[PDB]
Design an enzyme around this catalytic site. Structure first.
Site, PDB file in Angstrom:
ATOM      1  N   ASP A  91      -7.029   6.327  -4.379  1.00  0.00           N
ATOM      2  CA  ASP A  91      -6.475   5.016  -4.604  1.00  0.00           C
ATOM      3  C   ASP A  91      -6.609   4.601  -6.060  1.00  0.00           C
ATOM      4  OD1 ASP A  91      -9.046   4.132  -4.875  1.00  0.00           O
ATOM      5  OD2 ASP A  91      -9.041   2.747  -3.198  1.00  0.00           O
ATOM      6  N   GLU A 133       0.776  -1.224   0.000  1.00  0.00           N
ATOM      7  CA  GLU A 133       0.000   0.000   0.000  1.00  0.00           C
ATOM      8  C   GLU A 133       0.809   1.277   0.000  1.00  0.00           C
ATOM      9  OE1 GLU A 133      -3.032   0.163  -0.364  1.00  0.00           O
ATOM     10  OE2 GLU A 133      -3.891  -1.786   0.280  1.00  0.00           O
TER      11      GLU A 133
END
Ligand SMILES: [Cl-]
Ligand SMILES: [Cl-]
Length: 162
Positions: free
Chosen positions: A20, A11
């Site tokens: 994202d 991540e």
């Protein structure tokens, strides 16, 4: 290698609100803030999460705190899930980390939707599961990350992350 290090690799770490891969407002170590298209809404969920007016910016410690909460919740969510629990219990320590990773990325519901793959994992049919896991949107939208997780399920080692 451990779950924390693994997800941190997958991540990344960002201290300002960002979007994202799906275009959703996120922050820290993959902590989804909201699916709403409004920055304001995101800034609002952020302060509520942290407990102060952040103005879309957090510190490292604060990111880490969200991270710890996220990991713990993923595990607890797996354990309370009738579909997931049995799989998780049948796996060795390394493969359990792979399942946690998927849950952190896609939610319990999402993961529980991989019915066929879950069965193969439970049966310990590593190669067949990896092929089945690959036939998914997940794999087509985030192939690099998916390849790492899949390889982890296939091999039971941390090789994809070394
Ligand atoms: Cl939260
Ligand atoms: Cl990717």
């Amino acid at each position: 290698m451990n779950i924390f290090e693994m997800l941190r690799i997958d991540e990344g770490l960002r201290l300002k609100i960002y979007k994202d891969t799906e275009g959703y407002y996120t922050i820290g170590i993959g902590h989804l803030l909201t699916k709403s298209p409004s920055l304001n809404a995101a800034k609002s969920e952020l302060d509520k999460a942290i407990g102060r007016n952040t103005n879309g910016v957090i510190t490292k410690d604060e990111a880490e705190k969200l991270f710890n909460q996220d990991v713990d919740a993923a595990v607890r969510g797996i354990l309370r899930n009738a579909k997931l629990k049995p799989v998780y219990d049948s796996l060795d320590a390394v493969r359990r980390a792979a399942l946690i990773n998927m849950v952190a990325q896609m939610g319990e519901t999402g993961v529980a939707g991989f019915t066929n793959s879950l069965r193969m994992l439970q049966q310990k049919r590593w190669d067949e599961a990896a092929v089945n896991l690959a036939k998914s949107r997940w794999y087509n939208q985030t192939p690099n990350r998916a390849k790492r997780v899949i390889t982890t399920f296939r091999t039971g080692t941390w090789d994809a992350y070394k």
